[PDB]
Amino acid sequence: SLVPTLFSTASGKPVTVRRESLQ
Amino acid sequence: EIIMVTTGSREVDKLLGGGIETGSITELFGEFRTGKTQLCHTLCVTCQLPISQGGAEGMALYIDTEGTFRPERLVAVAARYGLDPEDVLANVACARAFNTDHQQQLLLQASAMMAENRFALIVVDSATALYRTDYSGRNELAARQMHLGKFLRSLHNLAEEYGVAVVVTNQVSTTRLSLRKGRGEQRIIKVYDAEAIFGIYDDGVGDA
Ligand SMILES: Nc1ncnc2c1ncn2[C@@H]1O[C@H](COP(=O)(O)OP(=O)(O)O)[C@@H](O)[C@H]1O
Ligand SMILES: [Mg+2]
């Protein structure tokens, strides 16, 4: 289960992170 | 564990003993049009360069609070260093946050991204545009400097933990550098303590 972020690649690709990582 | 990311100018790197150090926070102080953002853009590509070329061989995390991040500049810099622009654009993550609500969550997200993937530089342009409003967003934020101080403290922790270089820009362990305007379109940088002249070009920061 990944979680959305406010970050995005300069190429425009949205960035996601695993919830456990945010945990 | 500490590497020096080339700034694109040999003279500046010589004054900075190789360039921007990793694992620590480097604060850029300068008025408008001093090249603070342009320097950050150049570093976002140099951090991806091979160590031999003065890079940290890592990605870049750009926190834009001034809304002045332009991916096209990164492309021009990549051309100078002979790096595929597509890769450099994919190796730079950026979050444009003007509200305090989003700005307050960036640090947490940055840590997770740095834990999942290898980053070499975290850019914050600028701390001046950070925490301008309160959490609601309706009013002015009380004691902004106290809130900003805690932000930098956590950012220094990320710097030490993930061994990433952190460049924070300010309009007008921490290494403080001052930017100024030279004779012409040249720029002068010096530590708060001995000065070096660098130029801003399409390819980005450089010498002469
Ligand atoms: N493509 C370019 N070629 C040459 N000089 C540039 C270019 N882009 C920006 N500059 C120079 O960068 C200087 C500083 O811009 P910037 O870093 O955005 O300012 P600040 O330090 O206030 O954030 C400007 O005065 C301008 O002359
Ligand atoms: Mg700026």
Side-chain angles (χ1 to χ4, degrees), chain A residues 4-11 15-19 21-22, chain B residues 61 63 71 89 92-95 102 105-106 109 112-113 116:
Chain A
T5 74
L6 303 168
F7 290 86
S8 298
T9 68
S11 59
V15 177
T16 60
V17 288
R18 307 159 303 183
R19 180 182 58 264
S21 301
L22 292 171
Chain B
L61 185 143
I63 290 175
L89 293 180
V92 172
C94 177
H102 295 164
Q105 322 165 7
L106 298 183
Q109 300 182 356
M113 300 169 57
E116 298 187 0

Side-chain angles (χ1 to χ4, degrees), chain B residues 3-193:
Chain B
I3 199 57
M4 312 303 295
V5 176
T6 174
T7 68
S9 175
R10 305 180 178 180
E11 309 301 335
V12 174
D13 298 347
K14 178 179 181 179
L15 175 60
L16 304 183
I20 306 302
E21 49 179 0
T22 54
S24 63
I25 295 190
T26 297
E27 290 175 345
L28 290 180
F29 301 90
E31 64 179 356
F32 199 68
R33 292 297 151 269
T34 44
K36 299 185 303 302
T37 309
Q38 297 299 142
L39 183 46
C40 292
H41 274 76
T42 304
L43 289 174
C44 288
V45 179
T46 61
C47 64
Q48 312 182 13
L49 283 170
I51 300 179
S52 60
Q53 305 219 334
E57 304 179 356
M59 283 177 307
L61 185 143
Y62 200 110
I63 290 175
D64 189 5
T65 69
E66 296 182 337
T68 63
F69 179 80
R70 300 299 175 266
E72 307 71 24
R73 292 294 293 96
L74 305 181
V75 171
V77 180
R80 159 184 171 177
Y81 290 100
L83 299 176
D84 185 13
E86 168 185 356
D87 296 357
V88 311
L89 293 180
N91 295 349
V92 172
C94 177
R96 194 172 46 90
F98 301 92
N99 57 341
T100 290
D101 173 32
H102 295 164
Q103 294 168 349
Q104 199 55 81
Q105 322 165 7
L106 298 183
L107 294 169
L108 330 169
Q109 300 182 356
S111 180
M113 300 169 57
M114 286 183 296
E116 298 187 0
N117 291 342
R118 187 59 168 270
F119 291 84
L121 168 65
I122 301 181
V123 161
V124 181
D125 187 18
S126 61
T128 61
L130 219 174
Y131 295 137
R132 280 312 176 183
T133 78
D134 74 336
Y135 181 32
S136 83
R138 195 220 273 179
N139 303 303
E140 301 285 19
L141 172 64
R144 187 180 82 94
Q145 288 288 333
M146 180 270 300
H147 302 278
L148 185 52
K150 297 184 174 302
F151 180 103
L152 301 179
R153 290 148 56 179
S154 58
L155 196 46
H156 175 270
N157 303 350
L158 298 178
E160 269 183 351
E161 172 186 359
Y162 300 93
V164 297
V166 171
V167 169
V168 180
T169 60
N170 313 273
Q171 214 72 205
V172 185
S173 174
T174 296
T175 305
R176 300 201 163 190
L177 286 310
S178 58
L179 284 70
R180 238 167 53 214
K181 296 168 183 174
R183 278 200 293 93
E185 236 300 321
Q186 296 182 356
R187 300 297 190 273
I188 306 180
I189 189 175
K190 86 164 189 60
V191 188
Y192 276 77
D193 181 2

